[PDB]
């Protein structure tokens, strides 16, 4: 099945600071993908879902993009509520892949 | 449930009611009347209060009388 | 609002039988089908298993294939996945989440499994 | 399958334009009764698109 891996190593930026993530599928899922945000202990949130739209409920400063294999997703300003650890997963096939992950610290 | 709200014999107004395309026109005037007993005989034109698109057919109609 | 909650998680025997729970409220369960994932600790997420909203129809992830039955209960409105032949490797935090990957989305906050 | 999607597969005539049919009534296809349940030449107008 397809495989979702992150290739962003863990990011430290400071507050106020725009960051960049990219999840990368191993073959072609179309606009299928969907970003989350999860905080430790914490319940994962769908930041974007498919490709553009944002999701409802998500501040406007998270952005979806990405097309094809690549998808890519951009914070406009950082936050202490931001910084967690962020993952993608292909929605394209029956069986559903989960991405590696990268983690966000201030 | 209500897709329109409005918030604003001797007397005669007159309606015609009708549905073309999902669209129902009602043509309202309000001409006094002198007779009590029957609208004495007269032509009136009816003009088109407004237009509402309602899409729901209507095969039949009633009508509200207060009561004292 | 929708309230997605996880229970019948708990420390369980190598080989051991582990049933979990997923609450629906505050939506038509019945309407929606239901994905279930799990969280292994220092790991990204691994989707587990999907049932569809009647339930008839269901696939499940290939690490837990032949192991990990999902069951659910329309009444009851609750998704069970049992759980067979639980390994050391099996071990994480599951996460039931209703339509995942698009708007609908949402995500249980979850019980922790050990084993 | 987006169970969010139906279309009206069955329907006794054809709608006019710009007209609205939310009836979820039993079709009666065969010429036995539906009775308001689902039988054998009766079908649930709406199918869920797939």
């Known amino acids: 099945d397809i495989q979702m891996t992150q290739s962003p190593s863990a990011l430290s930026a400071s507050v106020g600071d725009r960051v960049t993530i990219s999840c990368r599928a191993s073959?072609?899922?179309?606009?299928?993908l969907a970003w989350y945000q999860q905080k430790p202990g914490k319940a994962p949130k769908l930041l974007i879902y498919a490709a553009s739209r944002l999701q409802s409920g998500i501040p406007s400063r998270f952005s979806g993009s990405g097309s094809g294999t690549d998808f890519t997703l951009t914070i406009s300003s950082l936050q202490p509520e931001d910084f967690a650890a962020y993952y993608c997963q292909q929605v394209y096939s029956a069986p559903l892949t989960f991405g590696g992950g990268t983690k966000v610290e201030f | 449930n209500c897709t329109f709200e409005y918030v604003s014999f001797k007397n005669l107004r007159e309606f015609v009611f009708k549905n073309i395309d999902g669209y129902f026109k009602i043509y309202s005037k309000h001409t006094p009347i002198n007779l009590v007993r029957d609208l004495p005989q007269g032509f009136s034109a009816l003009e088109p209060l407004v237009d509402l698109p309602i899409g729901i057919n209507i095969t039949r109609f009633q009508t509200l009388l207060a009561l004292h | 609002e929708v309230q997605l909650v996880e229970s019948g998680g708990g420390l369980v025997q190598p080989g051991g039988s582990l049933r979990l729970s997923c609450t629906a409220s505050?939506?038509?369960?019945?309407?929606?089908?239901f994905h279930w994932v799990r969280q292994a600790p220092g790991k990204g997420l691994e989707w587990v298993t999907i049932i569809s909203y009647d339930g008839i129809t269901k696939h499940y992830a290939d690490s837990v294939k032949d192991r990990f039955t999902v069951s659910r209960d329309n009444s009851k409105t609750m998704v069970y996945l049992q759980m067979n032949n639980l390994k050391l490797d099996d071990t994480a935090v599951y996460y039931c989440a209703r339509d995942l990957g698009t708007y609908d989305d949402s995500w249980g906050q979850g019980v922790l499994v050990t084993v | 399958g987006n169970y969010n999607y139906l279309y009206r597969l069955f329907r006794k005539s054809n709608l006019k334009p710009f007209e609205r049919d939310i009836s979820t009534e039993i079709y009666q296809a065969g010429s036995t009764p539906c009775n308001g349940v689902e039988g054998f030449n009766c079908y649930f107008p709406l199918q869920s698109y797939g």
């Open positions: 505050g939506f038509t369960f019945s309407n929606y089908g």
């Open positions: 073959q072609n899922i179309d606009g299928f």
